[PDB]
Enzyme design. Structure first.
Site: not given
Ligand SMILES: *[C@@](C)(CO)[C@](*)(O)[C@H](Cc1ccccc1)NC(=O)[C@H](Cc1ccc(OC)cc1)NC(=O)[C@@H](C)NC(=O)CN1CCOCC1
Ligand SMILES: *[C@@](C)(CO)[C@](*)(O)[C@H](Cc1ccccc1)NC(=O)[C@H](Cc1ccc(OC)cc1)NC(=O)[C@@H](C)NC(=O)CN1CCOCC1
Ligand SMILES: [Mg+2]
Ligand SMILES: [Mg+2]
Ligand SMILES: [Mg+2]
Ligand SMILES: [Mg+2]
Ligand SMILES: [Mg+2]
Lengths: 196, 211, 222, 233, 195, 226, 204, 195, 196
Positions: B1
């Site tokens: 993000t």
């Molecule tokens: C950027 C893209 C990455 O740093 C940003 O922080 C986003 C923030 C965000 C907030 C709200 C909604 C969506 C995104 N973060 C993510 O994309 C996180 C990054 C992350 C990955 C792994 C982690 O564990 C240590 C922590 C943070 N990704 C996720 O949370 C990811 C695991 N979830 C999803 O992709 C869930 N989605 C996938 C598609 O179907 C719906 C749910």
């Protein structure tokens, strides 16, 4: 440790060595591993001495309370109390127990309770570190419905070999005979069993 | 993000990207990282998507209950603190949530940064996420208090674009919000692919990139 | 040390139409390099015109579905047999997943159905509860294989109109159920070729205002 | 969290036209030591279900007692305990599956792999697997441990899919099971020659066979094998 | 956070605290006030782990304010410092300790004396003429050992404090974004807006 | 992988599946796992694919030079001995697990070879992730005094068991038959039971769909005259 | 940490009717940071094309190495090296570093100048040859590329149709990979003409 | 060391390198020149592990100077950059690799063009209009992406460079003690003494 | 693995099971563990099959070269070559070898070479994972100067028990008889030895 219990015509005999080690040091060379939980229900202990003493004491308490209420307990009932303790506390215990007892109805019975807390009723059982070396000998020489004298010789010869090969086993050979006649304690010294 | 938000003369701008990742795999191209808590309250999301969604929707429950009990809208300061207190309960349990609470209340426009450590910071400008450094570069050199609504919206839009370009874990699209004393105003979803080429031509920037 | 989790493989696919939705999943269940079952249903009719599939660790998937089905039952009891809308189900599932934030249901969940305006709806979840409404979503083992194909063939990404040369995009024309099912079957046939955990069978659940319909298709068993 | 101590190896099973067959050897291993040779790992529940268990024997004995108590409890205030409200294979399985998944969720599993084989009230064949993780699946053939790797391939040559079940007789199915048990004895170092076999048929009921032995074994060709490459004598 | 300094002069206590707040590799703020007024004549600065610092400070503040209302009386700096120490000593053996170091600058209206107390996260209390936490003392104590007198004026205290900050700004690898300086005396607490 | 070796009356047969995998992904759907050491000595490899190839080409090269030096046809025991001593030297770091089979002036031979350098002798062998599925078939149906046709059937059935039941194995069956007093016959794609069905749709795009920035001719020819 | 995914990148090759195509993205990064959008991963030695993914320093090093070796080959043989021969050379050269390998995923593409037969091949980082008929994929979005190629590809495509197929396979795979993109190049190769096209794509 | 920046404008290459050197918790020097002249029209700045940086730079310098004397000819910036890359690519698989990142700014007298090459310790070479190593790019590339043109003057290049340093000084937690700026053009190498 | 070598009146007999395991999978159920390093000098191998095969091949090479130069080597000389390899490479080897041979002068001799590379000349030797279970049996039943038929029965009964209790042991019982008469190979199948 080398322990065994063997059923025979008139009942059952428990046998054990007398060595307790702390590594390679022999902390006690005249240990009594044959322990009484009821008049004619005895057990052989292997594993953690603290754990097996604590268990046998609790079992002795349960069977004393059982007797006060319901009369003389069966050997199976005694083995069930051991099992229940060994099984439910398997994560914090290191106990390998052989239970042996005499009823007039069921006669001589032997139950073994290894590490996991499982129960196995057998004609005879062997356990302890020294048992590994006599699986072949005991299997070849055991017969059902042996005489008292035959069974004493069987245990004596078996434990003699276990002691001979296992460093953790040694000292004297203690035996407890469980029959209708009563409870007889036996002891056999090195000079007797070493020359077999 | 990448997320950002800043106070200015005519309220507060809030801009976020829309990418989501699972390792090197882009799991989502278009995720909403802004929560509409109420008509005058916004919440940005950076970190674990689940943590961001659960706790900020739980914040909205608690902000709604405030209105019912007191017959009055919660302040931005109080809302940000309720959230920071939630973070302090699950202190060290492994939550990952970086958020900016944006809104307009009696003291005027309000902006608070809150993270999973229970940190709560008041300020005129914030940016969170993997691409916040790229956004800060554009923001710091172009930000003024005397910005017009049009120029301010573009700044937040252009700042996300900068991050989306350079940061591998930022991109997809830009979501714009403008908070006024009559509430927040959504200024649309802007695809970065299309926006990049448009900005390149009109602005003359990204000269190194060929198009 | 005891590992409470496992990987039962499989892949799922949800596509939302204009007035319908599909939720497809392969019927193969595996551990490591062994096949447990060639036909173990993974997509379920949960009631109220909602279909659900929890892909990943089968034990957690079966537990979640079982709990959601239960949640639907109690929603009827508590709210005078009111129909659980797809958006309300999605939010309910978020709370089922986050109840386990610190010992997660290790599954990627998708639900499909119709929204309150009769339009096709697909919702996608992560193991810890983050969700979102989407037009298209592949989940599970071969998700990374299938999703780019759907970006291209459903949302017409990187596709422009000939003659203009990148100036005008391909217009986003809606897809029929027959066109969608082709993309579903080709998606799984392609995934079966290149992914070892995908194969044996394909089961598709189609949701319309008329109800839930099933379609089964054989896949390669190697 | 624990580790298995005294263990039982493969349990194998398959559906046939009128019922199910299940089999398992009579061995209780203590690591590499073939410690106990008289262990029954197929446990009947009524006259319509047989639960086959592999893995930790102490946990098996615990499950055996849960099932025995389940029958007792089902008979309580139940005039139809030996008829319409008798225990079904699906009831017994779901109970076990509930217990297994709960125990794994407390990080204190029953270290087992279980196959519940039986015939339902309506004559339908029941065959489902559950393990220490609470993972459940059903198939025309099911096997645990080594059986999954060696028995299933052989049993799936008889019943490769659902439509092959009505074409498969009890003689063919039993023959396949017995051959699979021989193959496991050749190749599984934690197996024994002695085994038990149970058939649950919708017409002939429950047939429980004990003290079965692997027979018709091929060893003669070993005399010709000499050295590990270049040795001739 | 990082640098918090304290000096007790003739008739006042001066606390200097850095303005920087850093998340990851980015400085989020360069105007952060790392202090809380516990009572009209008692100020506490703090430094330690993110989040814990403010939570602890505000918790202490609430307790002292509660005491003030209940008794209609201001606790002495010594009494406040002992209360704070006990809370930290209580905290260090908790499941999750509060990782906070504090300086408590107060003016005792009864004795007509300024007082500076240095307390670390373990609950280690010491009354000092000048103090610091973390690495701050490594750079500054040599200057303070040399220049400090107990009869110094507030203005001389500020000049010696400037010299300490200049040394920190020269020899620390860390950009702490200057300091907010506050003075605690008989008239209460005030901030030096130009430093 | 699934690979097998089966002895019969007047020779030996080896067989293999044709799937190669990068974790859960199938890299090649029609891989060739049956390698040639010498004309009448063929091996089949499981484990690290590059290692099975490299070690096979190396020993095959040295076997050819040996055959030229001695004016004799190469023996399977020579390939066996050279392979195991090479593998033993690298202490299992060369992840080559092979079934070596062939015919030579001494007769017909069948050996297995593990990465650490241990060898085995047998009438029927199996290696790879599908070895257990294949061995179940071999143990069920193998007998003494097999014919050529029975051995090919048994071999391919054993590979099929791996194809259907092992996820690490799939696609087609390759076979090589080495009979005494004959040329070895390599039967590439002996069985083809996993042909992909016709797709429901054609994904051929309209020309001009892809957006282009620049076009240029690439000069692959050398510098020109005049 | 993982050398094969520090810099990012992808390469894909396809066979058509009397033609081959090879394509690559242009990104070079330091994990999350994009560094260059002009890092081409496809090289050619005469009429044989080599695409290399993985660790950028090894990509550069190997190009220089195969340029070295093909230039000597040509001086001694008095002819340009062919794809089949070059494929063996790549395999040999990679395996000589078996226990200290180049962290790369090479892809060979070309047309035999004598037989006219289209040829593609892929390798692992230590030389195992994958001589596919249809297509070869390599890089951080190899899973994505496998999915696209397996569904979009059909045999005997004409050069201008093959171009669209390989381009869409690369583009849409790259758009689902954080470490790939930032531009793309496609080589369309025929027996005696080669066209190179830079694709327009999203720059995030 | 930490921050090294580079920008290639119309007719020159500008390299900016931090002045700080830190041992333990103390900044030992605030005037360190992290650069070596390889030839009259080629300058190399460097950053990496302590000791390795200078040893590597001086080793490269000696080799290029040796070449210059032997051939009585200055190598092109491209040739020098390739030589440096090979040495680093050779180094990364050594027993103890040289942990050094470099920027090579040169003016090619043959082509009459400025050239900037960025090479990391792995031997990863890229020709760029502007470049950086470590975390420097995270803060500065957004500004450069926005403001950079290829027809910029040296003075405009310096102004854009000042903006980059100002952003670094604002958002980095790290005090790098300003930068030494050097310009490489047709007339050779010179240092901007006021920055 | 279960291996043993027993001296008797007319010479020496080597015995072994035929099971080779990879964990719990039986990779080979008809292994030949009795390996020839010279005409009438054979060895039984235990431990890493790669290591023991590599050693026995090197030893066979040394004794073939010894014979070309100095004539028929003694069993002691063969055991010394084994030892020298096992001892000097003890850090990189896992080999437990029993050496057995027949001379006309020295008759039947048995040497055992355990893990460390020490050498021990014995009347009989047992080794392998299954040997633990028959220490007691073999000690009780071994006699010096047994007949060929007695010695065959002794080995058959002993290995039968080792196989019975050890999961890593099994299959057929192979034996090699070393006498002045020559070299005789024997084999005994499960149906024969299991019923003992
Ligand atoms: C950027 C893209 C990455 O740093 C940003 O922080 C986003 C923030 C965000 C907030 C709200 C909604 C969506 C995104 N973060 C993510 O994309 C996180 C990054 C992350 C990955 C792994 C982690 O564990 C240590 C922590 C943070 N990704 C996720 O949370 C990811 C695991 N979830 C999803 O992709 C869930 N989605 C996938 C598609 O179907 C719906 C749910
Ligand atoms: C089946 C697939 C598994 O046993 C079979 O053994 C094949 C054998 C084979 C032989 C010749 C050609 C093709 C296939 N093995 C493979 O397909 C292996 C699987 C494998 C992956 C990784 C390994 O390292 C532990 C070992 C085996 N494939 C490959 O080796 C090939 C795809 N290379 C790689 O995946 C890259 N390896 C290179 C070495 O480092 C690890 C990754
Ligand atoms: Mg204890
Ligand atoms: Mg002793
Ligand atoms: Mg398969
Ligand atoms: Mg202190
Ligand atoms: Mg990006």
């Amino acid at each position: 440790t080398s322990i065994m219990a063997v059923t025979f015509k008139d009942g059952v005999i428990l046998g054990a060595d007398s060595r307790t080690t702390t590594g390679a040091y022999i902390a006690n060379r005249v240990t009594d591993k044959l322990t009484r939980v009821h008049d004619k229900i005895w057990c052989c202990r292997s594993g953690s001495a603290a754990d097996t003493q604590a268990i046998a004491d609790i079992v002795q308490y349960h069977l004393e309370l059982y007797t006060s209420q319901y009369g003389t307990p069966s050997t199976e009932t005694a083995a069930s109390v051991f099992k229940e303790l060994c099984y439910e506390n398997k994560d914090n215990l290191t106990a390998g127990i052989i239970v042996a007892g005499y009823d007039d109805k069921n006669k001589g019975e032997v139950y073994t309770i290894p590490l996991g807390g499982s129960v196995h009723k057998l004609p005879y059982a062997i356990a302890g570190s020294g048992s590994t070396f006599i699986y072949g000998y005991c299997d070849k020489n055991f017969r059902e419905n042996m005489s008292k004298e035959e069974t004493v010789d069987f245990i004596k010869h078996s434990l003699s070999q276990a002691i001979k090969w296992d460093g953790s086993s040694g000292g004297v050979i203690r035996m407890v005979v469980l029959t209708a006649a009563g409870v007889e304690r036996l002891i056999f010294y090195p000079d007797e069993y070493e020359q077999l | 993000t990448t997320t950002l938000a800043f106070k200015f003369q005519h309220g507060v701008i809030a801009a976020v990207d829309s990418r989501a990742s699972a390792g090197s795999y882009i799991s989502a191209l278009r995720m909403n990282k802004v929560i509409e808590i109420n008509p005058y309250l916004l919440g940005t999301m950076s970190g674990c998507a689940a943590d961001c969604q659960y706790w900020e929707r739980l914040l909205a429950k608690e902000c709604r209950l405030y209105y019912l009990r007191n017959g009055e809208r919660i302040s931005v300061s109080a809302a940000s603190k309720l959230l920071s207190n939630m973070m302090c309960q699950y202190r060290g349990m492994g939550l990952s949530m970086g958020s900016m609470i944006c809104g307009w209340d009696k003291k005027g426009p309000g902006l608070y940064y809150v993270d999973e450590h229970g940190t709560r910071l008041s300020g005129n400008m914030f940016s969170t996420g993997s691409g916040n450094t790229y956004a800060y570069g554009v923001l710091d050199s172009n930000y003024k208090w005397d910005l017009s609504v049009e120029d301010a919206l573009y700044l937040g839009k252009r700042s996300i674009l900068a991050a989306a370009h350079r940061d591998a874990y930022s991109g997809g699209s830009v979501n714009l919000y403008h908070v006024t004393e009559d509430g927040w105003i959504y200024h649309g979803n802007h695809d970065v692919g299309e926006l990049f080429w448009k900005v390149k031509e009109e602005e003359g920037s990204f000269n190194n990139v060929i198009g | 040390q005891f590992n409470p989790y496992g990987d039962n493989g499989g892949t799922i696919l949800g596509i939302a139409g204009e007035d319908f939705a599909v939720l497809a999943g392969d019927t193969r269940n595996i551990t490591d390099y062994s096949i447990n079952s060639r036909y173990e249903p993974k997509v379920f009719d949960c009631g109220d015109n909602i279909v659900m599939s929890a892909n990943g660790f089968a034990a957690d998937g079966d537990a979640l579905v079982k709990r959601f089905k239960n949640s639907v039952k109690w929603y009827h009891f508590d709210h005078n047999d009111k129909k659980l809308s797809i958006n309300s189900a999605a939010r309910n599932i978020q709370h089922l997943l986050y109840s386990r934030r610190f010992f997660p249901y290790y599954v990627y969940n998708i639900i499909a159905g119709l929204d309150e305006d009769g339009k096709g709806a697909v919702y996608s979840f992560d193991p810890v509860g983050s969700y979102q409404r989407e037009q298209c979503r592949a989940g599970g083992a071969a998700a990374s294989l299938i999703m780019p194909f759907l970006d291209n063939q459903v949302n017409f990404k990187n596709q422009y109109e000939p003659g203009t040369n990148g100036k005008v995009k391909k217009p986003l024309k809606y897809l029929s159920v027959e066109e969608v099912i082709k993309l579903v079957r080709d998606s799984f046939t392609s995934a079966t070729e290149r992914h070892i955990q995908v194969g044996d069978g394909l089961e598709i659940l189609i949701v319309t205002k008329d109800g839930v319909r099933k379609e089964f298709y054989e896949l390669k068993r190697d | 969290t624990q580790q298995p101590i005294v263990t039982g190896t493969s349990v194998i099973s398959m559906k046939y036209d009128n019922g199910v067959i299940i089999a398992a050897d009579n061995l209780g291993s203590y690591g590499s030591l073939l410690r106990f040779n008289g262990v029954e790992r197929l446990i009947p529940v009524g006259d319509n279900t047989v639960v086959g268990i592999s893995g930790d024997i102490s946990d098996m004995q615990h499950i055996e007692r849960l099932l025995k108590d389940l029958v007792t409890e089902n008979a309580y205030d139940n005039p139809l305990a030996d008829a319409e409200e008798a225990l079904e294979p699906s009831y017994i399985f779901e109970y076990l599956a509930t217990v297994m998944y709960q125990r794994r969720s407390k990080m204190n599993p029953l270290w087992n792999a279980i196959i519940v084989a039986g015939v339902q009230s309506n004559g339908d064949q029941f065959l489902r697997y559950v393990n220490l993780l609470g993972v459940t699946y059903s198939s025309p053939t099911l096997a645990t441990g080594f059986g999954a790797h060696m028995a299933n391939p052989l049993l799936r040559k008889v019943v490769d899919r659902e439509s092959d079940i009505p074409k498969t007789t009890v003689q063919v199915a039993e023959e396949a099971i017995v051959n699979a048990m021989r193959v496991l004895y050749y190749r599984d170092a934690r197996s024994s020659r002695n085994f038990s076999l149970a058939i649950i048929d919708k017409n002939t009921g429950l047939t429980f066979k004990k003290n079965l032995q692997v027979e018709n074994m091929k060893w003669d060709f070993a005399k010709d094998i000499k050295g590990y490459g270049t040795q001739k004598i | 956070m990082d640098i918090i300094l304290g000096i007790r002069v003739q008739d006042s206590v001066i606390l200097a605290s850095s303005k920087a707040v850093t998340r990851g590799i980015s400085v989020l703020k360069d105007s952060d006030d790392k202090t809380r007024q516990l009572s009209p004549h008692t100020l506490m600065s703090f430094a330690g782990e993110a989040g814990d610092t403010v939570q602890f400070a505000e918790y202490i503040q609430a307790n002292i304010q509660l005491y003030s209302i209940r008794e209609d009386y201001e606790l002495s700096p010594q009494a406040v410092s002992s209360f704070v120490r006990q809370e930290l000593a209580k905290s260090i053996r908790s499941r999750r300790p509060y990782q906070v170091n504090v300086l408590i600058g107060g003016y005792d209206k009864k004795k007509n004396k300024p007082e500076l107390y240095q307390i670390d996260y373990l609950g280690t209390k010491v009354e000092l003429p000048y103090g610091a936490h973390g690495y701050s003392g490594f750079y500054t104590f040599s200057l303070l050992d040399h220049h400090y007198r107990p009869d110094m004026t507030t203005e001389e205290g500020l000049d010696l404090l400037k010299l300490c900050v200049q040394e920190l700004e020269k020899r620390m690898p860390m950009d702490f974004k200057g300091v907010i300086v506050k003075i605690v005396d008989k008239d209460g607490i005030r901030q030096v807006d130009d430093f | 992988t699934t690979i097998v070796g089966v002895k019969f009356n007047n020779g030996v047969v080896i067989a293999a599946d044709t799937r190669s995998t990068q974790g859960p992904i199938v890299a090649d759907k029609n891989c060739a796992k049956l390698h040639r050491i010498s004309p009448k000595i063929w091996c089949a490899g499981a484990g690290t694919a590059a290692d099975t190839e490299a070690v096979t080409q190396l020993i095959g090269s040295n076997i050819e030079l040996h055959s030229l030096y001695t004016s004799r046809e190469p023996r399977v025991v020579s390939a066996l001995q050279m392979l195991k001593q090479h593998l033993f030297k690298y202490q299992g770091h060369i992840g080559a697990y092979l079934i070596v089979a062939g015919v030579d002036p001494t007769g017909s031979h069948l050996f297995s070879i593990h990465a650490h350098g241990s060898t085995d002798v047998g009438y029927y062998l199996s290696l790879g992730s599908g070895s257990l599925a294949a061995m179940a078939v071999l143990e069920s149906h193998w007998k003494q005094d097999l014919t050529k046709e029975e051995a090919i059937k048994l071999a391919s059935d054993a590979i099929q068991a791996g194809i259907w039941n092992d996820l690490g194995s799939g696609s087609n069956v390759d076979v090589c038959v080495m009979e005494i007093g004959k040329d070895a016959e390599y039967l590439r794609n002996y069985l083809t039971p996993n042909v992909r069905e016709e797709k429901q749709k054609s994904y051929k795009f309209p020309r001009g769909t892809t957006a282009v920035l620049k076009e240029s001719i690439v000069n692959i020819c050398d510098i020109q005259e005049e | 940490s993982d050398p094969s995914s520090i810099n990012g990148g992808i390469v894909v090759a396809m066979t058509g009717k009397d033609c081959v195509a090879i394509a690559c993205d242009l990104r070079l990064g330091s994990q999350s940071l994009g560094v260059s959008n002009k890092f081409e991963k496809i090289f050619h030695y005469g009429h044989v094309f080599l695409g290399i993914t993985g660790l950028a320093t090894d990509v550069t090093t190997l190009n220089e190495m195969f340029r070295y070796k093909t230039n000597l080959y040509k001086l001694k043989e008095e002819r340009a090296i062919e794809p089949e021969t070059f494929t063996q050379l790549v395999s040999s050269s990679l395996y000589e570093r078996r226990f200290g390998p180049y962290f790369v995923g090479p892809v060979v593409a070309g047309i035999n100048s004598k037989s006219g037969k289209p040829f593609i091949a892929g390798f692992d980082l230590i030389g195992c040859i994958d001589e596919a008929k249809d297509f070869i994929v390599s890089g951080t979005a190899s899973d994505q590329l496998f999915g696209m190629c397996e569904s979009l590809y059909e045999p005997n495509l004409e050069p201008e149709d093959l171009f669209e197929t390989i381009s869409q396979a690369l583009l849409n795979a790259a758009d689902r990979d954080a470490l790939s993109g930032w531009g793309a190049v496609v080589y369309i190769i025929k027996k005696d003409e080669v066209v190179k096209r830079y694709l327009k794509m999203r720059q995030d």
